[PDB]
């Protein structure tokens, strides 16, 4: 009873009518019958319905319809590229059936609210994916499918047509093909790969222009801030060597015992840290 | 290579599974399969094979030894450690597991760990030999106090004259003659008049003989003998012989008395 | 001043013995000592199960306990009244189960039931802006002339910790 859901599926209305079938469909993964839920998300929306059984969601920690993580809204291949691939799960036939069975007993014996072993891992995060995690609901995802009479030029329902009248996606784009099983296991997922390419460009971690340099060239200081903000932020890292301050261009230089600590302060800092409700931007030299 | 090797693996692998499914048990099939994957250094597969075999028959001690061995061969110390713990937990009576477990820890250098294991082992009140091995373990390091402590527990767990004698002898070997004497006193005190015989009393006599307390030896020999059963007959004879020897170490009066 | 684990005022990163300063994600499951005593090596066996469920492992468990007298409150049959309670609760629970089984033999649900949900995503832009939502659950009507939808016959091998056992001359051989 009650599905497991994204906030993005469930709807942008707080009031929702949602129907239930006892054994509605096989799950497209572990292939068992399971309680299925439909509901209307919104005014122009599509009537989504749960695609996979609740168990294999608890297993990989995901929405039932979307298969996007609960916290990050990221396809599974991504958050695995983000932490731990070694979760695994047999893809192969009768194994899948077997492992699902056992893991279904293991889950039965848990407190109920926890994605099994992954959650022991799931706490430690934020490497990148937080910064590539999506922020707001994305409703373009629930729109009705593309009317396929109209996309041949004919559709004779006129304005009534609940489907959507517009140009489809060119089958050329590798982002088209998108199997379900595939998106689930984290194989060759085009979306996930795209997000990976997007991850790399994040100006961030390579640093190291020069050896031993712990000099921090800090842009976007501002004249509200004091140094004491700086120190009481940065004593976490280690033994400071010193701090140079310039308020004429509002840039603050810093120096630490080891370069390692400076890299760190970059990492922890870059395009993340803000104090005095004002962004504190960092660069090398 | 790339594909050609692969096909080979399917034929073997599939065959192994077929054999297992046909016979179910007959764990020589399980083991051979495990060994083959081990040889290809696919040890994650190997682990699963061993666990599956254990599900079929957890009592089979060869299986467990092969499993732990496999982990050790691949330097997977902590896996092996886990496995050993399981083996002794589920089949505590199997001494082979305990001997190997302590040996492994000793090789790793973890004396404390090994001691801990042996203390667990001793809770099962095992067998004379196990206790000896624990004591010897201690004696590979100086640790004489530890050894003596173990003996103190051991001679009560298996209160056999012989063990008491052995304990005393241990003290003698390390020159704690004061304590050795005390141990003999304790032994005779404990056993009491009710049951004691030849061996212990002889050994005590020998001890005092070596301590050069000849008069005392005679006192002990006589007084303790008269205090108890005497004659059994064989034991008595042995004792008499010992006494004679001690004496040696007009005076053939009992030669005539025994004959007459 | 020390700069080593050996040796708040310091204003230094110091980690005194062995608190880890870099990610490891180590497998090891914490060794434990309980109250006065023992490294809880029996924790191996429980591992799969919950703390609640019992499992014998130490030698002490195996060793005999004596006597207990002609009788003591220690061994007795819960009582009349405990039995009545147990029996009654059992009876009702079984009956529920049986009725479900019996549903097959005897081939109608009308409840509208509302639920109130708290999400776990929140963030104030996720809903219109509500910490909760409400969902009216309705059971879908089944077509009575619909055949069994999907196929159950498929068969998958029985799943797999053993309790400790705690239990020859050449000529005999």
């Amino acid at each position: 009873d009650f599905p497991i859901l994204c906030q993005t599926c469930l709807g942008e209305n707080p009031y929702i009518r949602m129907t239930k079938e006892k054994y509605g469909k096989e799950c497209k993964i572990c292939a068992r019958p399971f309680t299925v839920f439909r509901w209307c998300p919104g005014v122009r929306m599509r009537f989504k319905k749960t695609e996979v059984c609740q168990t294999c969601s608890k297993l990989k920690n995901v929405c039932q319809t979307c298969l996007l993580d609960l916290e990050y809204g990221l396809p599974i291949q991504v958050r695995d590229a983000g932490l731990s691939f070694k979760d695994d799960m047999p893809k192969s036939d009768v194994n899948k059936e077997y492992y699902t069975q056992n893991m279904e007993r293991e889950i039965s014996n848990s407190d109920g609210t926890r994605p099994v072993g992954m959650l022991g891992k799931a706490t430690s995060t934020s490497d990148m994916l937080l910064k590539l995690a999506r922020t707001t609901p994305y409703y373009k995802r629930n729109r009705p499918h593309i009317c396929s009479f109209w996309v041949k030029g004919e559709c004779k329902r006129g304005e009534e047509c609940p489907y959507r009248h517009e140009k489809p996606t060119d089958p050329d784009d590798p982002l088209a093909d998108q199997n379900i099983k595939d998106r689930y296991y984290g194989i060759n997922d085009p979306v996930a790969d795209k997000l990976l390419k997007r991850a790399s460009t994040m100006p961030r971690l390579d640093p190291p222009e020069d050896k031993t340099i712990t000099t921090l060239y800090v842009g976007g200081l501002g004249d509200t801030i004091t140094e004491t903000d700086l120190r009481n932020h940065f004593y976490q890292f280690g033994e400071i060597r010193t701090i140079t301050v310039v308020q004429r261009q509002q840039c603050a230089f810093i120096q630490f015992a080891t370069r390692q600590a400076a890299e760190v302060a970059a990492e922890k800092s870059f395009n993340k840290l803000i104090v005095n409700g004002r962004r504190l931007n960092v660069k090398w030299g | 290579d790339e594909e050609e090797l692969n096909d080979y693996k399917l034929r073997k692998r599939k065959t192994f599974e077929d054999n297992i499914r046909k016979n179910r048990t007959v764990i020589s099939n399980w083991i051979k399969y495990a060994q083959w994957e081990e040889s290809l250094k696919e040890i994650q597969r190997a682990r699963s094979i061993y666990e599956r075999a254990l599900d079929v028959d957890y009592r089979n001690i060869t299986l467990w030894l092969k499993y732990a061995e496999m982990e050790m061969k691949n330097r997977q110390v902590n896996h092996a450690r886990n496995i050993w713990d399981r083996a002794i937990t589920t089949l505590p009576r199997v001494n082979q597991f305990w001997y190997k477990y302590t040996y492994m820890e000793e090789m790793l250098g973890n004396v404390a760990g090994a001691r801990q294991v042996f203390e667990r082992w001793m809770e099962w009140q095992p067998e004379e030999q196990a206790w000896h091995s624990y004591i010897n373990f201690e004696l590979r390091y100086k640790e004489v106090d530890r050894a003596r402590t173990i003996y103190e527990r051991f001679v009560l767990v298996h209160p056999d004259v012989k063990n008491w004698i052995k304990y005393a002898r241990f003290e003698e070997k390390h020159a704690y003659f004061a304590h050795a004497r005390k141990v003999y006193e304790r032994a005779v005190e404990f056993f009491g008049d009710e049951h004691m015989d030849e061996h212990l009393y002889v050994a005590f006599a020998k001890f005092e003989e070596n301590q050069k307390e000849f008069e005392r030896v005679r006192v002990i020999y006589k007084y303790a003998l008269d205090r108890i059963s005497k004659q059994e007959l064989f034991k008595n004879y042995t004792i008499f012989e010992k006494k004679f020897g001690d004496r040696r170490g007009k005076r053939r009066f009992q030669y005539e008395e025994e004959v007459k | 001043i020390p700069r080593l684990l050996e040796d708040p005022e310091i204003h230094v990163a110091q980690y005194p013995l062995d608190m880890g300063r870099k990610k490891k994600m180590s497998n090891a499951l914490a060794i434990q000592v309980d109250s006065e005593g023992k490294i809880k090596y029996d924790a191996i066996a429980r591992q799969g199960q919950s703390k609640d469920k019992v499992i014998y492992s130490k030698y002490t468990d195996l060793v005999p306990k004596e006597v207990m007298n002609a009788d003591d409150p220690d061994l007795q049959r819960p009582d009349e009244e405990a039995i009545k309670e147990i029996t009654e609760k059992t009876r009702v629970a079984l009956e529920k189960s049986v009725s479900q089984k019996v549903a097959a033999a005897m081939p109608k649900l009308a409840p509208a039931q509302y639920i109130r949900y708290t999400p776990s995503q929140q963030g104030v832009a996720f809903n219109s802006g509500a910490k909760q939502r409400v969902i009216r659950m309705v059971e879908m009507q089944k077509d009575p002339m619909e055949p069994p939808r999907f196929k159950i016959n498929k068969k998958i091998p029985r799943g797999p910790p053993p309790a400790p056992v705690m239990h020859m001359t050449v000529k005999e051989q």
Binding site: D88, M89, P90, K91, S92, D93, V94, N95, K96, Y98, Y99 | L5, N6, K9, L10, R13, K14, E17, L40, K41, E42, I43, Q44, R45, R47, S48, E51, R52, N74, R75, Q76, V77, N78, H79, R81, N82, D85 | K24, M25, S26, N27, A28, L29, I31, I44, Q47, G48
Partner: peptide, 29 residues
């Protein structure tokens, strides 16, 4: 058919015990 040569038939990842198995990996043939 692929329950063998593609994907490890049924997998039991070994249970993890008081020691570190993170580091360990093995060589090819």
């Amino acid at each position: 058919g692929v329950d063998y040569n593609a994907e490890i038939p049924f997998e039991k990842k070994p249970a993890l015990g008081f020691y570190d198995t993170s580091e360990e990996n093995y060589q090819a043939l």
